[PDB]
């Protein structure tokens, strides 16, 4: 269980610059990132084993994302992961992998965490981590955009867990994803 608060905050500022977020809301988003990560890492690793691979590559992350994410979320996320990997390889001057990939979330840490889920002699590809990092950032961004929107609609300045609730429960796919994810624990 890790901390993504700083990064989550950076994503919030890209989409709702003048909207704040409470510590209680941040705690829940941190749980969101961790829980989703675990579900995707767990599936990807299994997928590598069944396809007889010794490395969890972006192909597997993609397959997992498609099994775990509903409908439109899966396709947009796939678009995001793919785009990040492409950027990452296209632009090599930047010092940070997150920066090369155009991400706010931490690619390096996500690679490290991804390792714990790789059981055997199985390896984690750099691209697998970039793809995963992009997906988590994207999901987090969707929740934040919707929660920020709910706060604005209610004429308030800060995102609370109630706004997170309205955003998630009011969106069929996110609701489905979260309920399924909860069932997973």
């Amino acid at each position: 269980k890790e901390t993504y608060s700083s990064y989550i905050y950076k994503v919030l500022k890209q989409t709702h610059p003048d909207t704040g977020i409470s510590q209680k809301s941040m705690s829940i988003l941190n749980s969101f990132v961790n829980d989703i990560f675990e579900r995707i890492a767990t599936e990807a690793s299994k997928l590598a084993a069944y396809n007889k691979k010794s490395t969890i590559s972006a192909r597997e992350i993609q397959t997992a994302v498609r099994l775990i994410l509903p409908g439109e979320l899966a396709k947009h996320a796939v678009s995001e992961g793919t785009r990040a990997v492409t950027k990452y390889s296209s632009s090599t001057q930047a010092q940070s992998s997150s920066a090369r990939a155009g991400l706010q979330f931490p690619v390096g840490r996500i690679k490290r965490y991804l390792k714990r889920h790789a059981t055997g002699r199985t390896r984690v590809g750099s691209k697998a981590a970039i793809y995963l990092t992009a997906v988590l950032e994207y999901l987090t961004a969707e929740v934040l955009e919707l929660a920020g929107n709910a706060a604005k609609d209610l004429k308030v300045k800060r995102i609370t867990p109630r706004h997170l609730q309205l955003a998630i429960r009011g969106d069929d796919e996110l609701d489905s994803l979260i309920r399924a994810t909860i069932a997973s624990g």
Partner: peptide
């Protein structure tokens, strides 16, 4: 901690703002 199940009186949030160092 507070997890996703919480979302299923959430407006009673008196927690302080999340902030990062300006320095």
């Amino acid at each position: 901690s507070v997890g996703l199940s919480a979302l299923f009186d959430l407006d009673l949030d008196d927690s302080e703002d999340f902030t990062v160092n300006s320095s």
